[PDB]
Amino acid sequence: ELLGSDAPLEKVCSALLEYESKRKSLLEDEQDDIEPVWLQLATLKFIGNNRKLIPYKIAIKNPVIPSSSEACLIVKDPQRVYKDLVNEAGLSKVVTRVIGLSKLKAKWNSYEQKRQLRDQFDIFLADDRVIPMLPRILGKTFYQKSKVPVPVKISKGTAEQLKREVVSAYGATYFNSAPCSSFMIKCGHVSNTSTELAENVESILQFVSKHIVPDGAKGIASIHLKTSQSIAIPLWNNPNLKELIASSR
Amino acid sequence: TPLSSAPEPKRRFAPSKHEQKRILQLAYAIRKGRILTSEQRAERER
Amino acid sequence: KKKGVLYVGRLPHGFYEKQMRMYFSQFGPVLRLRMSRNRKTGSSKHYAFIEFESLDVANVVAETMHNYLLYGKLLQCKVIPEDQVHENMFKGADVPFKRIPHATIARLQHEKPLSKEKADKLITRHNRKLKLKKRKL
Amino acid sequence: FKRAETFINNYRQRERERIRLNRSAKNKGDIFVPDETKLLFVIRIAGVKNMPPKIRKVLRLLRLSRINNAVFVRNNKAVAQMLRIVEPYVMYGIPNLHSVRELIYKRGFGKINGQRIALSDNALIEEALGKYDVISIEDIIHEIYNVGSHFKEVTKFLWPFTLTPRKAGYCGEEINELIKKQV
Amino acid sequence: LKVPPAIAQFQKTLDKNTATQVFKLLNKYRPETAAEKKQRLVAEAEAVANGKVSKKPYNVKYGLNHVVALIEAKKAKLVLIASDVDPIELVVFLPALCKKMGVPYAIVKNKARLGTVIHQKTAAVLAVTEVREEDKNELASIVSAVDANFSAKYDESRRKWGGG
RNA sequence: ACAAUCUUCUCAUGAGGUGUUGAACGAAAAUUUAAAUUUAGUUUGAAAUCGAUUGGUGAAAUUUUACCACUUUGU
């Protein structure tokens, strides 16, 4: 309704569940990893002035990061105070390691050391005040292997805020803005059913049209639904994209 | 492998007892006024 | 007499064409110098080839600058034999990589004005391509 | 001779300076612009080889072509922006009336006929600044302290001070203390 | 004259560049002076005299009996032998003991330079046993340099009678 | 002279924070405009032996820019 005064949802997302299921065709270590759902968006005009190395906190109701995924928290000095707060909040099983910024800069200097730290956790969360430093220190070994630290605001440093922020951080999808006209957003996996997947799509679309696309949903060229190896089924096409680009330019 | 199979003494995993001997000796003479404390060392200098 | 060529590897970030020229000229003059850079962005490949007018000057430099502890990197200097030197492998000598900013040039053409005829050409067979995708599905 | 590690260190400083100028110019075009002082003293701390072309041009405009050169400038938006660009290589502070008089009496030298000549006599000052209503060293010092209309002309006539032997950036009233250590 | 290989090896010392980089790491781990040790202990004395738990210290290991015991225990990561010990037989076995125990070792110049690190007039041998996590890469790079600039170099030269 | 200023947060409630080693392997999609940017992912020693792309733009006094990048080379 917001995008084009129409809602061609539900039917396409539900059909995609059967489309990937039909395309199904001893090991010791097993995991519940599922193929992600890639929501492709095309915009009429470029949406990024420059490479922004922070994710978008797209709040969602169906988390794309399972609660079994380990988390690593990066805080400002000293690390002992925030280590005590994490333990007192009951996040020991979630926030496994808390690394102070000075310790992260010093004790992890080699590329192999940075890669070992990167592979030791599934998601990285960072204090909002220390996020601008992580472009350095962490380097290309983090920002290209799908490991972008999350800007979690823990400024006041209290247990309830930590629990709310982590739950909010886990229950959200992220997308790193890049200068282009096309991008993909993680909407979920096959584990999430059709109705939950549809809810994730519309919530992301509202967030995208609000704080990502400068002119809103009117500037959306086309949108498609895709998986790792599935066909990019066209979710929706702008009925007036061709004339809008001609008139704008 | 290391040449010596002798067990590791506990002294290498605990705070030094030689320094603790001196700390108690220094703390004693601080009470007796034999050694000037750091705060009163500065006052005497100026 | 014979123009010796030296290969320098594991260059620390910052030991670039200007820095190598003023340094290696102390041992002996250098007239051409080239360091490999990536096609896409021109970032240094941390390895380079430096020639010398005389093979003897190249040989002595390789002796004193092999396994040099520079910035935590063991600089490697080996003299390349002539049979493995190629004629076209020293083009763009000391050439400031004209790093074309493809991101902005894409934006400029993206933001470049497009007329109705240009938009019609831009549309082309997009509907047909969408129909072809629908037919495939 | 020069070691290889020296050239990389110079390069790293050059790349370090390039980013810093990129910070100050783009998206951070705001200067502190200290108030309560119409005149400030700026001394070039140090410079390195192969310095950025923009920094050298700012130094040439500010007459800081040599290290340990002290020049008095008027507080302005353009001056503050130039000071921010050359902040790493220049230290700024608020001079005092006593410090300014002492500097003029000790190391006060003007530019007469294109040559740096000490203002040991008031006859030269009167002849050089006849149209500026300046005839003695005290009059020039008072005009500089008050930052008058002829202060810019007096500053151009006066050669830069050589306060040879410090922190980087704004120093405030502590810069006047360094003047006592130089004169 | 003609010298045996075990004494000839001490004329081939570490190069100036690698030695200068070695002492940059060593100077981070100097033992605290007699004055600094007294200041630290008296500071803890006042906290005891009035009224009131640390980490393990970090420093470079020195002493001939101490270092040889650390090599035999395989506790030493890097052993730096002085090149001019007045009785040479004091350290004439150290390169062989370091080879047997797999300890990266180097022969550096000016035993006085070694002593300056430890606030002593003279040291026959220095040994780095275990450093802070910040300097793991710096020590690792030095050990690789010592392998190439000292062990890979010479080696065939250290088995030949020198002099003559 | 292996030393130097990469943000350990601001503004205003939202908007910002411009910064990443190289090489190799490897998807399948989208718009731009095959070439181009996005783009599932991965492997690694601050690893390396031709493959430099080679356009735009300025700024000193055409050679000079080691990112000058279109917002595009000395105040």
Residue numbers in the entry:
A (entry chain K): 5 to 29, 42 to 265
B (entry chain m): 213 to 258
C (entry chain o): 102 to 238
D (entry chain t): 51 to 215, 232 to 249
E (entry chain G): 69 to 120, 125 to 236
Q: Could you pull the original sentences from the published paper?
A:
Eukaryotic ribosome biogenesis is a complex, tightly regulated process that involves many ribosome biogenesis factors and spans different cellular compartments. Here, we answer these questions and reveal how the nascent 60S moves from chromatin to the late-assembly compartment in the nucleolus of Schizosaccharomyces pombe (S. pombe). In vitro, Fkbp39 binds DNA and nucleosomes but dissociates to bind nascent 60S particles and to partition them from chromatin through LLPS. This partitioning provides directionality for the nascent 60S to move into the nucleophosmin-rich GC, where its biogenesis continues.
We analyzed the isolated Ytm1-containing nascent 60S by cryo-EM, which revealed 3 major states in both wild-type and fkbp39Δ cells—each state can be further classified into multiple substates. Among other differences, the RNA domain III is flexible in state 1 but stably incorporated in state 2. The accumulation of state 1 particles in fkbp39Δ cells indicates that Fkbp39 is required for a step in 60S biogenesis along the transition from state 1 to state 2. To gain deeper insight into those biogenesis defects, we characterized state 1 in more detail. In the wild-type dataset, the majority of particles (~85%) had density for Ppp1 and associated proteins (state 1B), whereas in the fkbp39Δ dataset, only ~55% of particles in state 1 exhibited density for those factors. These data suggest defective ITS2 processing, and in agreement, we observe the accumulation of ITS2 in Ytm1-associated particles in fkbp39D cells. Our data indicate that Fkbp39 is required for the stable incorporation of Ppp1 and of the Ytm1-Erb1-Ppp1 complex into nascent 60S particles, which is essential for ITS2 processing and the assembly of the RNA domain III.
